[model samples]
Target: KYDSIPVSVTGPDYSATNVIENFDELKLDPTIRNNILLASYQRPTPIQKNAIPAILEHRDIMACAQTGSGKTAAFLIPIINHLVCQDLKTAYPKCLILAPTRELAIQILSESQKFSLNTPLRSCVVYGGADTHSQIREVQMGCHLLVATPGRLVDFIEKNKISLEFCKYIVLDEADRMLDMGFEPQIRKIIEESNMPSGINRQTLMFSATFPKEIQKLAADFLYNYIFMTVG
Candidate 1:
């Protein structure tokens, strides 16, 4: 038996793709950009440097980078920039971020909160342990961005508490860890069984420190033509 081989894109060092060296060149909304500067972020980490541009182009990405390497912002920055100008009057989220654990989901929401200041975007996080009714209340009130753990998110979907039909942007943070914890079926249900559009109709970003064979198969199943990036 042979492994599947999809054409993979390489890193900046190997090609002529211009890697952004600073936050100024990103052309983000002034409010969001100012917020990023306010947070004392002087430079983009390796993952940010590579993934931001690709994401801004609305390309699907499979990024391999360490936890502390600014992986959160790599996906968040571009997604927020694109959504900042939209009229987000719907209770349905346009962007969905799935993390492996409650802690990571909360952390992503915290970072998103920083950039969303003075912008029209609102975000909320949901996990298993929290009060379900309160979480449902927050979502019903409206959130343009949603950060959630797979299991709790599936619960929300099954109970008809959340709708993914409007969720065109999806990010899987720490995907390898999620798979290790055996969250594959839940993830699949949310992405496949729910009302989400097919891969071609939406943008998917998957980030992890490693890409095992199972992760590759996931990439094949869940992603359209995608850029595979790795950084230290």
Candidate 2:
């Protein structure tokens, strides 16, 4: 349903350094470095270089890139950096990351944990097809990041166990897949309920392999002055 076009032409000898030298320049926690190394991430990928800085600056982003492009770490590192550096008195989570499937939710959680390994930031995973009692407890105990599937998250909300009032950062990863899995209603409900607080001032980032017109329309309602970025 979409066609590709070359947007720009490059000349020879246009060299750029994508290496993230001196992680300290980004003010990342030492733990993040150890975790990245542990995961065998010797250096930042191209997408990570492009996305992390903007995201850490609190920009609203809609990124389209291929799968296995390290999109998760691209966003995760910046988010963890932001959270680690922010001063807030609240014990609740400051970020909520949504995925369409349990596997993806877990994957995001692992990435967050890796990036936040050195920081005091805490994170947890929530998805359907598992017991939620522990998830409820983890949220109550306080966390900086929460990754979840919409269906399981809604159930937790319905049980009056978790609140999105304190949530400030929202990442809707895999938007197309969420819709494909028939999670539109649940996703809408979560967004509607989470946005109830007028002072929240939430920053939302949406990432997908491709975007349909309907997804764009849906995103417009929630994102303000969003910038689009894409990578191969």
Candidate 3:
């Protein structure tokens, strides 16, 4: 299950050498650092090697990394850096991620909570086939991170149960799959119609297993100064 590749350099950066040799350099919480080890993440994967630092450096990201290249942790680590350190709270989620499927969204939530153990940051996932009442209650109580599937997320937004006005970090994991399933309108609505910050205004990351030329161009138009990277 360990598919490794040498990290590559691409695009441009404010952090001269964005490649990270290890996770310790990230300056993450000691407890959280232990959690990584608890989860058996000793050496950074090629994707984690670069993408984690890229995000922590506050750079916008568009990764076409291969499946199982540690994409989820790559994004979540930086988010934890922001959320846990400041220990901020809000009436709404500070970080929001949109996944294509319930399984994917649930997976994100699982990893999020795993790494977030013993931290103040709280997260929740919303999807169909579950009671909205319970999901709504989680948001209403408070959440630092919120992961959700497109249809249910859109429903929550349209119904005014949750607001993304203070969203500091947003991710579209598996963007290709979500778009492939025809969630463009919902995606655009969140980006353009909602109170969420514009792409350039916040940390926005997009991840997919594949990035066709057309998708690259289209993703760039919406990303606005996005960094492109790939991992084996």
Candidate 4:
């Protein structure tokens, strides 16, 4: 069970194979594969092996792997690939990516822009700062991807700075950090109480360096029969 990836949870059966030694094997759209090469990523990492395919299949996932394990792309690629290939231009919260820190949010926003180059997919990052006003404008313009920190995201919510009506796809990056920052209430407010859809309709994916027992319990509230993936 490669790094205990075969996490048998009480949910629909999920299975993955680690035979994809090259990006071409993923059958990604022409441009998406090209972007992988552009990033100088010659081969998929172990985490990518287990995480990418499950995401491509649109499965709710809880991935436990440390940072710099290519976990970012493991989730970002599929979502960006879907939006770009399908010609989907999402508005506010079209795809909500929640990060615990402003720096992490900016980092993901940068990679998102890199992957979306030459494509119509646009994204912006919002955090707690004076510059947040700029992000408010970007959301007004609409983007396929929206990355933000927990508190500032709530800030946007209060002012109706953006719409969450179609914000169905949500990703919690470094979810363990959110626990540290006491972001559960804000996240819950964004998903559970906002205009977002029910778990039955929306898709939630949680990515973390480690999933302590406490974090796992909280994640269960947001995910619906998600696939558990672990990699070192």
lDDT tens digits, residue span 20-127, model 3: 656554555545535766766777877777777678767778888766878888888778757888874224778899999889888989888888888877888888
True lDDT of residue 203, candidate 1: 95
Candidate with best lDDT: 1
Per-residue C-alpha lDDT of model 2 across residues 1-232, encoded as one tens digit per residue: 8997653211111122232333434555544445667776766665666667666656677777756877888777767766776634223567889999889998888888777766677887778895756565564647778898989878877775566887878889998889889888888888876543432377788888887986787678776666666675
Query: Tens digits of per-residue lDDT for model 1 on 174-232?
Result: 99999999999999998898888775678999998898999999988988778878874
State the TM-score for model 1.
0.88
Ranking by lDDT: 1, 4, 3, 2
**TM-score versus the correct structure, for each prediction:** 0.88, 0.80, 0.87, 0.87
Q: What lDDT would each prediction earn against the true structure?
A: 0.80, 0.71, 0.76, 0.76
Find the candidate with the highest TM-score and give its number: 1
lDDT tens readout by residue for model 4, 76-192: 877888777767422465689999998999899988887887777878788878795545456555876889888888887787776688876789999999988999888888878
> Would you give me the overall lDDT of model 1?
0.80
Per-candidate total of colliding backbone pairs = 0, 1, 0, 0
Ten-residue stretch with the least lDDT total in model 1: 7-16
Question: At residue 16, what lDDT does model 3 achieve?
Answer: 38
**TM-score of predicted model 3?**
0.87
